Amino acid sequence: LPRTVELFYDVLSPYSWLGFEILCRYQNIWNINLQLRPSLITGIMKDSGNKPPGLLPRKGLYMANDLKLLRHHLQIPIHFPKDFLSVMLEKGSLSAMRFLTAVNLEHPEMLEKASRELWMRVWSRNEDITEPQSILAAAEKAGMSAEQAQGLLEKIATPKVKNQLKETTEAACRYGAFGLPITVAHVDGQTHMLFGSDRMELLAHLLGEKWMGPIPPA
Amino acid sequence: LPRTVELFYDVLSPYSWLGFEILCRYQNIWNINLQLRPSLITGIMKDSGNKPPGLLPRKGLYMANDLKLLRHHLQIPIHFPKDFLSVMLEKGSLSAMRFLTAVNLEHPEMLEKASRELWMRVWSRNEDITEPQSILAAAEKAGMSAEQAQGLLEKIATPKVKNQLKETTEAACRYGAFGLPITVAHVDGQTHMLFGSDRMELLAHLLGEKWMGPIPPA
Numbered sequence: 001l002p003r004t005v006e007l008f009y010d011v012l013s014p015y016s017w018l019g020f021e022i023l024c025r026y027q028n029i030w031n032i033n034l035q036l037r038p039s040l041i042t043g044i045m046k047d048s049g050n051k052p053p054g055l056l057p058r059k060g061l062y063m064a065n066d067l068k069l070l071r072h073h074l075q076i077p078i079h080f081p082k083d084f085l086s087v088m089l090e091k092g093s094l095s096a097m098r099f100l101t102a103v104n105l106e107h108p109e110m111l112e113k114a115s116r117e118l119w120m121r122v123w124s125r126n127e128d129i130t131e132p133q134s135i136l137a138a139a140e141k142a143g144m145s146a147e148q149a150q151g152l153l154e155k156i157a158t159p160k161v162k163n164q165l166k167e168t169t170e171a172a173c174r175y176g177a178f179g180l181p182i183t184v185a186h187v188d189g190q191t192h193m194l195f196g197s198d199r200m201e202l203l204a205h206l207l208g209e210k211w212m213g214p215i216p217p218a
Numbered sequence: 219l220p221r222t223v224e225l226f227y228d229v230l231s232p233y234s235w236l237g238f239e240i241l242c243r244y245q246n247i248w249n250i251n252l253q254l255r256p257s258l259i260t261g262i263m264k265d266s267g268n269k270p271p272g273l274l275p276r277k278g279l280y281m282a283n284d285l286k287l288l289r290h291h292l293q294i295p296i297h298f299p300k301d302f303l304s305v306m307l308e309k310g311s312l313s314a315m316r317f318l319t320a321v322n323l324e325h326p327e328m329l330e331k332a333s334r335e336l337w338m339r340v341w342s343r344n345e346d347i348t349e350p351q352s353i354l355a356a357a358e359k360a361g362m363s364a365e366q367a368q369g370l371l372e373k374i375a376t377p378k379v380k381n382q383l384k385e386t387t388e389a390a391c392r393y394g395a396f397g398l399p400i401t402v403a404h405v406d407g408q409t410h411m412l413f414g415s416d417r418m419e420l421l422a423h424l425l426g427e428k429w430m431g432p433i434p435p436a
């Protein structure tokens with residue numbers, strides 16, 4: 001039976017995008033059932049008493065250099081902006097994550113593509129992801145029709161959508177999250193929580209699967 | 219010619235031990251010149267304004283679980299004691315790092331083994347590494363004679379040894395360190411600083427070498 005792997009992420013998290021692309025490349029290679037869980041990193045940080053690593057000068061500088069190298073190693077078009085702290089702390093990703101939650105509730109088959117497009121806007125093209133038109137553009141590029149995207153956008157402020165995002169974020173905390181991304185592997189009645197996009201080789205080991213690098217063949 | 223790769227470490231750092239063993243396993247496989255750089259993590263922490271991650275409850279908990287899994291994946295006999303905080307924040311590793319600095323100055327050929335034995339005491343058997351007799355035990359187990367070990371131990375308080383440790387620690391800070399371990403690769407004019415024991419696959423990519431996992435064919 002395929003092992004269930006849960007990935008908690010926020011589009012505001014560049015490292016979550018990296019982990020997400022690696023798991024998506026392996027979802028049809030490894031015997032796993034990938035379940036995407038849109039969460040709010042702000043909620044996780046507040047609950048754990050943690051703070052964004054970029055607030056400390058040297059860590060912020062390191063992130064920039066690290067992401068620059070990972071762009072080539074992982075072959076993910078990430079272009080980290082110099083004013084990333086403003087993007088993270090001043091703008092945020094509330095509407096975007098509420099939108100992805102609505103997508104997960106009514107059109108889950110579109111969640112992977114819709115998520116990738118939002119990440120592409122904020123961390124690849126340095127485009128806005130807080131305004132309605134911005135989210136609509138991302139949704140349409142993901143394949144949704146103007147009508148579908150519009151219908152979902154109208155529900156981002158409904159109690160059902162808000163409560164679902166809150167619950168998913170709380171589930172991450174219950175697993176012990178202090179940041180994102182976190183991957184939860186359910187292997188033979190055992191649950192393992194791994195933090196970071198750099199624990200995938202360890203995940204392979206736990207699953208008894210073969211690690212073939214961040215870019216597996218075929 | 220072989221590419222110079224510098225590894226900055228402190229025996230007080232368990233992750234530094236994991237990074238160290240991986241590089242030691244590859245030092246004769248990849249075209250590199252591994253340079254060990256004994257450093258003080260406390261000095262790096264103070265200089266960067268960072269704090270031990272284990273101080274945050276949820277992260278301290280994660281570290282324990284992470285190291286337990288890495289133990290089997292990397293095949294390193296690491297046993298994280300319940301009171302790791304006391305060993306770190308309280309006891310420290312000053313004398314031990316000054317000792318290794320002395321070893322590096324007069325018996326460089328013994329640095330690798332001396333370093334490993336000290337890690338074995340603190341992170342494997344959970345034994346003391348602050349008292350001279352504790353350090354002597356490690357040095358002798360590493361292959362040094364009581365005469366040699368005793369000789370180096372008498373120099374850990376000399377200005378030459380103190381300044382060398384300070385300078386090496388400062389070099390790590392100048393490279394942008396906010397913690398350990400950090401690996402600095404010198405590849406064709408360019409200098410890349412990588413943080414963590416989990417960036418070794420990326421290092422292989424930068425060096426144009428082949429990554430064969432944490433345990434390459436012996």
Ligand SMILES: N[C@@H](CCC(=O)N[C@@H](CS(=O)O)C(=O)NCC(=O)O)C(=O)O
Nearest residue numbers: 013014015016053178179180196197198
């Ligand atoms: N070395 C790991 C780091 C992940 C990370 O720093 N995640 C940030 C969020 S970032 O994507 O905005 C995070 O949640 N950090 C928590 C912490 O560092 O305590 C990796 O390669 O994925």
Ligand SMILES: N[C@@H](CCC(=O)N[C@@H](CS(=O)O)C(=O)NCC(=O)O)C(=O)O
Nearest residue numbers: 231232233234271396397398414415416
């Ligand atoms: N995911 C990396 C973490 C290294 C780490 O947390 N290092 C601590 C010291 S620990 O060995 O005592 C450190 O210096 N952390 C700095 C920070 O987390 O900001 C790995 O797998 O090596």
